[PDB]
UniProtKB/Swiss-Prot annotation, chain A:
It is found in: Cytoplasm. Component of the ribosome, a large ribonucleoprotein complex responsible for the synthesis of proteins in the cell. The small ribosomal subunit (SSU) binds messenger RNAs (mRNAs) and translates the encoded message by selecting cognate aminoacyl-transfer RNA (tRNA) molecules. The large subunit (LSU) contains the ribosomal catalytic site termed the peptidyl transferase center (PTC), which catalyzes the formation of peptide bonds, thereby polymerizing the amino acids delivered by tRNAs into a polypeptide chain. Transmembrane segments: none annotated. This is Small ribosomal subunit protein uS10. N-terminally acetylated by acetyltransferase NatA. Also partially acetylated by NatC. Belongs to the universal ribosomal protein uS10 family. The gene is RPS20. Disulfide bonds: none annotated. Component of the small ribosomal subunit (SSU). Mature yeast ribosomes consist of a small (40S) and a large (60S) subunit. The 40S small subunit contains 1 molecule of ribosomal RNA (18S rRNA) and 33 different proteins (encoded by 57 genes). The large 60S subunit contains 3 rRNA molecules (25S, 5.8S and 5S rRNA) and 46 different proteins (encoded by 81 genes). It comes from Saccharomyces cerevisiae (strain ATCC 204508 / S288c).
Curated annotation (Swiss-Prot), chain D:
Component of the small ribosomal subunit (SSU). Mature yeast ribosomes consist of a small (40S) and a large (60S) subunit. The 40S small subunit contains 1 molecule of ribosomal RNA (18S rRNA) and 33 different proteins (encoded by 57 genes). The large 60S subunit contains 3 rRNA molecules (25S, 5.8S and 5S rRNA) and 46 different proteins (encoded by 81 genes). There is a cross-link at residues 28, 45, 57 (Glycyl lysine isopeptide (Lys-Gly) (interchain with G-Cter in ubiquitin)). The modification Phosphoserine is found at residues 32, 59, 74. Component of the ribosome, a large ribonucleoprotein complex responsible for the synthesis of proteins in the cell. The small ribosomal subunit (SSU) binds messenger RNAs (mRNAs) and translates the encoded message by selecting cognate aminoacyl-transfer RNA (tRNA) molecules. The large subunit (LSU) contains the ribosomal catalytic site termed the peptidyl transferase center (PTC), which catalyzes the formation of peptide bonds, thereby polymerizing the amino acids delivered by tRNAs into a polypeptide chain. This is Small ribosomal subunit protein uS9A.
UniProtKB/Swiss-Prot annotation, chain E:
Keywords: Acetylation, Cytoplasm, Isopeptide bond, Methylation, Ribonucleoprotein, Ribosomal protein, RNA-binding, rRNA-binding, Ubl conjugation. Component of the small ribosomal subunit (SSU). Mature yeast ribosomes consist of a small (40S) and a large (60S) subunit. The 40S small subunit contains 1 molecule of ribosomal RNA (18S rRNA) and 33 different proteins (encoded by 57 genes). The large 60S subunit contains 3 rRNA molecules (25S, 5.8S and 5S rRNA) and 46 different proteins (encoded by 81 genes). One of its GO terms (cellular component) is cytosol. This is Small ribosomal subunit protein uS13A. Component of the ribosome, a large ribonucleoprotein complex responsible for the synthesis of proteins in the cell. The small ribosomal subunit (SSU) binds messenger RNAs (mRNAs) and translates the encoded message by selecting cognate aminoacyl-transfer RNA (tRNA) molecules. The large subunit (LSU) contains the ribosomal catalytic site termed the peptidyl transferase center (PTC), which catalyzes the formation of peptide bonds, thereby polymerizing the amino acids delivered by tRNAs into a polypeptide chain. PROSITE patterns: RIBOSOMAL_S13_1, RIBOSOMAL_S13_2. One of its GO terms (molecular function) is structural constituent of ribosome. It comes from Saccharomyces cerevisiae (strain ATCC 204508 / S288c). The modification N-acetylserine is found at residue 1. N-terminally acetylated by acetyltransferase NatA.
Curated annotation (Swiss-Prot), chain I:
The chain holds residues 2 to 68 of 136 of the full protein. Keywords: Cytoplasm, Ribonucleoprotein, Ribosomal protein. Component of the ribosome, a large ribonucleoprotein complex responsible for the synthesis of proteins in the cell. The small ribosomal subunit (SSU) binds messenger RNAs (mRNAs) and translates the encoded message by selecting cognate aminoacyl-transfer RNA (tRNA) molecules. The large subunit (LSU) contains the ribosomal catalytic site termed the peptidyl transferase center (PTC), which catalyzes the formation of peptide bonds, thereby polymerizing the amino acids delivered by tRNAs into a polypeptide chain. It comes from the Eukaryota. One of its GO terms (biological process) is cytoplasmic translation. Belongs to the eukaryotic ribosomal protein eS17 family. Disulfide bonds: none annotated. It is found in: Cytoplasm. It comes from Saccharomyces cerevisiae (strain ATCC 204508 / S288c) (Baker's yeast). This is Small ribosomal subunit protein eS17A. Present with 30900 molecules/cell in log phase SD medium. There are 2 genes for eS17 in yeast. One of its GO terms (molecular function) is structural constituent of ribosome.
Length: 60, 143, 70, 141, 145, 206, 63, 55, 67, 80
RNA sequence: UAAUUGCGAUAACGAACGAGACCUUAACCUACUAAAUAGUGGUGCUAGCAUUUGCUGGUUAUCCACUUCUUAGAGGGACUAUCGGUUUCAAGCCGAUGGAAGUUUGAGGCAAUAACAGGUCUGUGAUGCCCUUAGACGUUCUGGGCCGCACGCGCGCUACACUGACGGAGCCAGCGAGUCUAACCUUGGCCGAGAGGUCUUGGUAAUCUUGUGAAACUCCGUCGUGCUGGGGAUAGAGCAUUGUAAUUAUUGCUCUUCAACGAGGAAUUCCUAGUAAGCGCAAGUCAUCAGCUUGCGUUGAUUACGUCCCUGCCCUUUGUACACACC
C-alpha cells in the first residue's frame, strides 16, 4: 500500500488537517510447465487493460 | 540425561563461561582494552576493568551458538544501547566494531567459532563441544 | 562528608553487637543506624552473612532483606 | 507419526505456536525449558496452566513453543495461551470429551484468557496529537 | 568484597596538583575535583598507575599518589593514547599536551586571546560576551552576564 | 502431595505450593479477611493468584473495576508519576518485596496487613463544595465503599511515594512502612492523618 | 465512638450542581425497620453499605 | 572592519544589558481595522440592472 | 445507542404484513427467509432488518403491535 | 509504430460530467444568458435519462461582486 | 437516540437529500482455493551433549506430505442474540449468560442546504484590472541576508535523581523505503578507541538490507543522598563525514570545561481502555541537517460512566423601527 500524506491546504492557514491518499498494488504469480506454443497462445490473449503480465523463463 | 546450553539460564551460563576463559589464560585480548569504551553510545568504560573482554567473548560465543551465522555488524547492533545526546532525545546507536571483530578473531584462534560461508561466523564443532560441556558443568553446580 | 564512609574499629564492633534485635536488616537499615554509607553497608551485608545473625530471605540488587538468626 | 495437535495463542501481536504430540512430558519454549522463560517475575504466568490442571497430565505428551512478534510481556500471555489450548486440543482429538471439558472448566474458572484471545488492539493515532485521543496543546492567544 | 580495618593510616582531605581532594570519596571520582581530569581521564590514569579503583582517595599510599600525578602530567610516556587528550596539536609547538589544574585556566585564556589578537570573528564574538558556536541568540540566554 | 516428574523437570517448591493451595508469590489467600463490614465486595481476595499481573479488562464497565484482585490494584497504583507510567514489572516486584518486608515485621499474612491498611484509611464521610452563593461552605457527605477503597489505595501509595522520594529508604520499605503503620492507624502514617483530617472537616460542617 | 451501618436500598439520583453527589435511601442492619436518605460522595449501586458516622440526620437538595 | 568592531566601545552585551527596554517590545497584536470587514470601502456599488444583466 | 433507522423498521413492517406465516420467533431462520423473499444489498442491512422483524414477531405473539 | 491512436464516439455525452462542463464553457463563451445556458445543460442531461444532475456557476458576471448559483434537477445522493 | 435516531401525540398521510445505509482498516474461522518470494511435520546428509530410545542445532531443494501459524481470493459471522430488570411494559435503556467480537463492535473515509468580504494572486502556462518592462520589479552570476540580540509571547526537547544514574549481562515489535541508463537500500571480511575508512556482496524486493536483535524494559553489579557518579548549558583543543563551498561554527566522534535546575506564582492544555502516560522506530523533508510532523508498534495505569457550576454552542419562546440584517 502506497501512502501519500499531505496537508489539504494549498497555503497554511487553518487547523492543520492531514489527508492520506493510497494506491494498492496487488501482485500474483502462477508457475506453468508447458511447451512453446501454449505459452505464446496464452500470453498474447488473456490481455487486459490494467493488468500487468510478465513471463520469465528458466530455473534461475 | 544429556545437555545443551539452551538448558541453562543466560546469566548462569555466560558468567560461568566468562570465569572459564579467565581461569584459562588462552585468549588474545587486544590490549587497548582497559582504555576503551565498547560504544560511543556509552559514557564510562566497563567497571570489570581486567576481564569484561571475557564477558563479551562468552556472550558472543553463546549468541553465535544459538544461531546459523552472525557478523560484526549484527553484534555491533546487538550490543549497543541508547546514547544520551545531552539535551536532545535518545537515539539507538550501534556499538564498537573493534571490540567485536577482535572478540570473533580471538574465539576463532581458540577454535570456538569459524568463518561461515553465507557470511559472518558460525559456532564451531569444537565450540558446540566445549560450550555444551561447561553448560553441563553449571547445571551440575546445582545438583 | 557527614560521616558513614570508612570502618573506625569501634564501628566494626558496633556492627557485630548491634545487629541482633534487627527483625529487618537492609542497606537502608544499616545507613539509618547513624553510620555506614550505602557502599560499606552493602559490604557489611555480605560479610554479616559470612556466618550467622542475618538470614537471606530476599534476593537481589536494589533490595536486600534479612532476619536475626535462630 | 504419533498423536499430535498444533495450536496457537495471541496477545497484542505476539503469536505463540504450540505443537503438542505424544511423548515423555517435556515443555520447551523456542528451544529451552519452560522453567527459564524470564521476564521471570511473570514465570508463574506460564507455569500457570500446568498447576491449574495438575502437574501430571503432561506425562503422555511433548510440548514445544515458538513465539515471534509482540514483546517481553505480549509473548508470555501468548505462550501460556497456546499451551493450555494445546492441552485441550489433544484431549479433544485423542482422549475424551469429559476429560476435555473438565479441562476447559478448570482453565476458565481461573482464566487470564487462557483459551480465548484478547481482542484488545492498538487504536490508530490521528493528526493533531501524538496519540489516538491525546491532542496537541493549544493557546487561544 | 571485604570487611577491612586500617589504623589511623588514611587521612581525610589530601592535597595534590595544587588543589584539595576529599578523602572519603572513591579515588577515581575524588581526582576529578582537579581541573582537566574528568571521569574517563581519572579512571584510566588510576588503572595505569596500578591502583585499586575499589579504594577511597584517603587510603592510597603516598607512593601511589606520587605515581598518580606523574602519569597525569606525562600521559604520553605512560602509553595513554592522545585522542584521550584535551590539547592535541598545540598550535605553536604543535606537540600534544594535557593541560591540568590551575593551568587549563591560562590556556583557555591564551586561546581566547589568540582569536581576539588576530581579530577573528569568533574572537570578536567572545569579546562581546555573546554565543560563539553560532546558536540563535534571540530567545535563549537572557539572565547570564 | 505426591511428586511427579517428567522430561524437563519442575522444581520441588514449584511443584509443591502450586498444585496444592493456589497461593501468592508464596503467601496464603485463605484466612485474610476484611475486618470492616462493607468493603467486603469491594476488596477482592479469592479467586487467588500467583503474581499481580493480569491482562484484565476492568475498565469497560462501571463497577467491574472492583472484581480486580486488591493486591494488584495496590501495585497498579504504584506505577505513576510520569517517569514510571507503565512499568508494571517494576511495580510488581516492589510489591513482592513489600509483602516480604511486611511479613518480617509482626508476622501476619502480609497480604492481610495490606487489607487492614486499606480498610483503615478510607474516609467514612467527607466533604464537597456546595454553591450556596459565591461564598461556598462545605456540605458533608457519606462516601461510597468504592471511593473508600480507591481513596485508601491512592492515599497509601502516594504517601509512600513522597516518603520514598529524595532519601535512602527504598520505595518498597516506605510502602511497607506506610502499610504497617496504617494496619492499625498509628497516626504516624501519611494516609491515616489525611483520613482522620478528612473526617475531621466533614464532621465540622454538619 | 458508635458505628452505624446502613445498606443502600434505593438509588434516587444525582444532586450537587456539579453532579458528583448521589442521593440514596439506606436501611440500617443493626435494627432495620427504619430508613433514611443520605448523600454519597463516590459511585454507588444497590446493596452497598455506608458507614453513617452519625445516624439521625438526612439532607435533600445540593446547590 | 574587524579591527573597528572589537575596538568599538558602545558594543557587546554589557552595553545593551545596561539599557532600559522600549515598550514596543511588550506591545500587542495592534490589529487595526477588522470590525470594518463587512463595510466595503470602495464607495462603489453594483446596481440592480447590471446584476440582472449578468445573472 | 442502538436505535434502528426507519429503513429497517419500515422493512420489518412490510415483511410482517405479508409473510407472517413463515417467519418465526427465531432470527437465524428469519435471516434466511429475507434472502429468498427480499432483495437487500448488504448482509449487514439484512441482518439488521431480520433481527428486528424478529423482535416485532416476538411481541406480536403476546398481543398486537400498532402499525 | 510502437504507439497507436484510435478515436471513439462516446455512448451518449449526456451522462458525461466532462462533456457537459465543456458544454457550459462553450455555451457561455458563445454569449448565452447564464440561466439559459445552465438549464439547457440540465434539461439535455435529464433528457438523456440521468437519475439527476447539478450545475454550479461561481464567479463574477458583469457585476463587480462575485456570486454563485445552483442549477439542479432530479435525484442525487452525496455521501459514501 | 451519537443523530429531524425513533416511539408516541397528532390536520395530517406517505416520501426524498443530510444522519443511517455504504466504503476502508483492525478483530474471529484447525470450513474453501493454494504457496522454493510464507511456513510446519517426516525423511535423508550431519554437529554437540547424553547415551536406553533422547535433547539441541546445521544443511534456498536430498526427497515426501501437509496449510495450524504467514500471505490474500471467495464465502461465513453479529442481528445489541438468549434470559431477565426497567420504562407510557412503546422506542429504548440496564444487568446476567453465551460469544472473536455486544460503547455507532473499535478507529477512520465520504458527507446536504447555507454562511465568512476566513486564508491562499508566494502551487499552478488558473485569472480580471493596475503597476513594471533594457540604468527591468525579466533573468542569471558573485557575495551577504532570512540565524542578526537589553527584552515580551507560543509550540517543544532535556531535567531536577535512588520506581534513579552509571557498568556489564538478558533480549522482544509494528508501520515503512530502496539503484537505469544509475550510484538508492546495504549484509559480509579486514583496518580503525570512536566517528569512519576500505574490499567485496545481495536486492527493481514476502526473494536482499531485515528476525530492521528499536527503546523503554528485565537481571547482576558500582555508586549512597552529598547541586553527587542527578543535570549537561556554556566553552577550549583535536579527528572525521556531506558538499564546489562548512567562517556566523551542517552533522558525526574524542578528551576537557560542568551553568541553571532542589517539582515550579497568577494562571492554563490534553485525555475515558490496549485509552492516558512513558518508550523507541519508519516515512515526509533530505547532498548534509529533527529537538518538527504523519503514522507505527512496544510497556501499560489511576479516575468518571455523572452533571449544567464555569465556559462554548444548539433549540424553543419572546422583542425589533434591523433585511447591506448589531460591523
Ligand atoms: Mg538492544
Ligand atoms: Mg546492553
Ligand atoms: Mg575535573
Ligand atoms: Mg540555536
Ligand atoms: Mg527519561
Ligand atoms: Mg443517504
Ligand atoms: Mg456516513
Ligand atoms: Mg489457514
Ligand atoms: Mg463474558
Ligand atoms: Mg479580509
Ligand atoms: Mg492560489
Ligand atoms: Mg525564519
Ligand atoms: Mg500548533
Ligand atoms: Mg541500563
Ligand atoms: Mg588511529
Ligand atoms: Mg548485481
Ligand atoms: Mg556534578
Ligand atoms: Mg549525566
Ligand atoms: Mg529522517
Ligand atoms: Mg516543518
Amino acid at each position: 500500500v502506497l501512502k501519500i500524506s499531505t496537508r489539504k491546504t494549498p497555503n497554511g492557514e487553518g487547523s492543520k488537517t492531514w489527508e492520506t491518499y493510497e494506491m494498492r498494488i496487488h501482485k500474483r504469480y502462477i508457475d506453468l510447465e508447458a511447451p512453446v506454443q501454449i505459452v505464446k497462445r496464452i500470453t498474447q490473449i488473456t490481455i487486459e487493460p490494467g493488468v500487468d503480465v510478465e513471463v520469465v523463463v528458466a530455473s534461475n | 540425561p544429556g545437555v545443551s546450553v539452551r538448558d541453562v539460564a543466560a546469566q548462569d551460563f555466560i558468567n560461568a563461561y566468562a570465569s572459564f576463559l579467565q581461569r584459562q589464560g588462552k585468549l588474545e585480548v587486544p590490549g587497548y582494552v582497559d582504555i576503551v569504551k565498547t560504544s560511543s553510545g556509552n559514557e564510562m568504560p566497563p567497571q570489570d576493568a581486567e576481564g569484561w573482554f571475557y564477558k563479551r567473548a562468552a556472550s558472543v560465543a553463546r549468541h553465535i551458538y544459538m544461531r546459523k551465522q552472525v557478523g560484526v555488524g549484527k553484534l555491533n547492533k546487538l550490543y549497543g544501547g541508547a546514547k544520551s545526546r545531552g539535551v536532545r532525545p535518545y537515539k539507538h546507536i550501534d556499538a564498537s566494531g573493534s571490540i567485536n571483530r577482535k572478540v570473533l578473531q580471538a574465539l576463532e584462534k581458540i577454535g570456538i567459532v569459524e568463518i561461515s560461508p553465507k557470511g559472518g561466523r558460525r559456532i564451531s564443532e569444537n565450540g558446540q563441544r566445549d560450550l555444551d560441556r561447561i553448560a553441563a558443568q553449571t547445571l551440575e553446580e546445582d545438583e | 562528608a557527614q560521616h558513614a564512609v570508612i570502618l573506625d574499629q569501634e564501628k566494626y564492633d558496633r556492627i557485630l553487637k548491634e545487629v541482633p534485635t534487627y527483625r529487618y536488616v537492609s542497606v537502608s537499615v544499616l545507613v539509618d543506624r547513624l553510620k555506614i554509607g550505602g557502599s560499606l553497608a552493602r559490604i557489611a551485608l555480605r560479610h554479616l552473612e559470612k556466618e550467622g545473625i542475618i538470614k537471606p530471605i530476599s534476593k537481589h540488587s536494589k533490595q536486600a532483606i534479612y532476619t536475626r538468626a535462630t | 507419526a504419533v498423536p499430535s495437535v498444533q495450536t496457537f495463542g495471541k496477545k497484542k501481536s505476539a503469536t505463540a505456536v504450540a505443537h503438542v504430540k505424544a511423548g515423555k512430558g517435556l515443555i520447551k519454549v523456542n528451544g529451552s525449558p519452560i522453567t527459564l522463560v524470564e521476564p521471570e517475575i511473570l514465570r508463574f504466568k506460564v507455569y500457570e496452566p500446568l498447576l491449574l490442571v495438575g502437574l501430571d497430565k503432561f506425562s503422555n505428551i511433548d510440548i514445544r513453543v515458538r513465539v515471534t512478534g509482540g514483546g517481553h510481556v505480549s509473548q508470555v500471555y501468548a505462550i501460556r495461551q497456546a499451551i493450555a489450548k494445546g492441552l485441550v486440543a489433544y484431549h479433544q482429538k485423542y482422549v475424551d470429551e469429559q476429560s476435555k471439558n473438565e479441562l476447559k472448566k478448570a482453565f476458565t474458572s481461573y482464566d487470564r484468557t487462557l483459551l480465548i484471545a484478547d481482542s484488545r488492539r492498538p487504536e490508530p493515532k490521528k493528526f493533531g496529537g501524538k496519540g489516538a485521543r491525546s491532542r496537541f496543546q493549544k493557546s487561544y492567544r | 568484597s571485604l570487611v577491612v580495618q586500617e589504623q589511623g593510616s588514611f587521612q581525610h582531605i589530601l592535597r595534590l596538583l595544587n588543589t584539595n581532594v576529599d578523602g572519603n570519596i572513591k579515588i577515581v571520582y575524588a581526582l576529578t575535583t582537579i581541573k582537566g581530569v574528568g571521569r574517563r581521564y581519572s579512571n584510566l590514569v588510576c588503572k595505569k598507575a596500578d591502583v585499586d579503583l575499589h579504594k577511597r582517595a584517603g587510603e592510597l599510599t603516598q607512593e601511589e599518589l606520587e605515581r598518580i600525578v606523574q602519569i597525569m602530567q606525562n600521559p604520553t610516556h605512560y602509553k595513554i593514547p592522545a585522542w584521550f587528550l584535551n590539547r592535541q596539536n598545540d598550535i605553536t609547538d604543535g606537540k600534544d599536551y594535557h593541560t591540568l589544574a590551575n593551568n587549563v585556566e591560562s590556556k583557555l585564556r591564551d586561546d581566547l586571546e589568540r582569536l581576539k589578537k588576530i581579530r577573528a570573528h569568533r574572537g570578536i564574538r567572545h569579546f562581546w560576551g555573546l554565543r560563539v558556536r553560532g546558536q540563535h541568540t534571540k530567545t535563549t540566554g537572557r539572565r547570564r552576564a | 502431595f505426591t511428586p511427579v516428574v517428567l522430561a524437563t523437570p519442575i522444581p520441588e517448591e514449584v511443584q509443591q505450593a502450586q498444585t496444592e493451595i493456589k497461593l501468592f508469590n508464596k503467601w496464603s489467600f485463605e484466612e485474610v479477611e476484611v475486618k470492616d463490614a462493607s468493603l467486603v465486595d469491594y476488596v477482592q481476595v479469592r479467586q487467588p493468584i500467583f503474581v499481580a499481573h493480569t491482562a484484565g479488562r476492568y475498565a469497560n464497565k462501571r463497577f467491574r473495576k472492583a472484581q480486580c484482585p486488591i493486591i494488584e490494584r495496590l501495585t497498579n497504583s504504584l506505577m505513576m508519576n510520569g517517569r514510571n507510567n507503565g512499568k508494571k514489572l517494576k511495580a510488581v516486584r516492589i510489591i513482592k518485596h513489600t509483602l516480604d518486608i511486611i511479613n518480617v515485621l509482626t508476622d501476619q499474612n502480609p497480604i492481610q496487613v495490606v487489607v487492614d491498611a486499606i480498610t483503615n484509611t478510607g474516609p467514612r464521610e467527607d466533604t464537597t463544595r456546595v454553591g450556596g452563593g459565591g461564598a461556598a461552605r462545605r456540605q458533608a457527605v457519606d462516601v461510597s465503599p468504592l471511593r473508600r477503597v480507591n481513596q485508601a489505595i491512592a492515599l497509601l501509595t502516594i504517601g509512600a511515594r513522597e516518603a520514598a522520594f529524595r532519601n535512602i529508604k527504598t520505595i518498597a520499605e516506605t510502602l511497607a512502612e506506610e502499610l504497617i503503620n496504617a494496619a492499625k492507624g498509628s497516626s504516624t502514617s501519611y494516609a491515616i492523618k489525611k483520613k482522620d483530617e478528612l473526617e475531621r472537616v466533614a464532621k465540622s460542617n454538619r | 465512638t458508635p458505628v452505624t451501618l446502613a445498606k443502600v436500598i434505593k438509588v434516587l439520583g444525582r444532586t450537587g450542581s456539579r453532579g458528583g453527589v448521589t442521593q440514596v435511601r439506606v436501611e440500617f442492619l443493626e435494627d432495620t425497620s427504619r430508613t433514611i436518605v443520605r448523600n454519597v460522595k463516590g459511585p454507588v449501586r444497590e446493596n452497598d453499605i455506608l458507614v453513617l458516622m452519625e445516624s439521625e440526620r438526612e439532607a435533600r437538595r445540593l446547590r | 572592519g574587524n579591527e573597528g568592531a572589537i575596538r568599538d566601545k558602545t558594543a557587546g552585551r554589557r552595553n545593551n544589558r545596561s539599557k532600559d527596554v522600549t515598550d514596543s517590545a511588550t506591545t500587542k497584536k495592534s490589529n487595526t481595522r477588522r470590525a470594518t470587514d463587512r463595510h466595503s470601502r470602495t464607495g462603489k456599488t453594483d446596481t440592480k440592472k447590471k446584476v440582472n444583466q449578468g445573472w | 445507542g442502538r436505535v434502528r433507522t426507519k429503513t429497517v423498521k419500515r422493512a420489518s413492517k412490510a415483511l410482517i404484513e405479508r409473510y407472517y406465516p413463515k417467519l418465526t420467533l427465531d432470527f437465524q431462520t428469519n435471516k434466511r427467509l429475507c434472502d429468498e423473499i427480499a432483495t437487500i444489498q448488504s448482509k449487514r442491512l439484512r441482518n439488521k432488518i431480520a433481527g428486528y422483524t424478529t423482535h416485532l414477531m416476538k411481541r406480536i405473539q403476546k398481543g398486537p403491535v400498532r402499525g | 509504430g510502437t504507439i497507436v491512436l484510435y478515436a471513439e464516439r462516446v455512448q451518449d455525452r449526456g451522462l458525461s460530467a466532462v462533456a457537459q462542463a465543456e458544454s457550459m464553457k462553450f455555451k457561455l463563451l458563445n454569449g448565452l444568458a447564464i440561466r439559459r445556458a445552465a438549464y439547457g445543460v440540465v434539461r439535455y442531461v435529464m433528457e438523456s435519462g440521468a437519475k439527476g444532475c447539478e450545475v454550479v456557476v461561481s464567479g463574477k458576471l458583469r457585476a463587480a461582486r462575485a456570486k454563485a448559483m445552483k442549477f439542479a434537477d432530479g435525484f442525487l445522493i452525496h455521501s459514501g
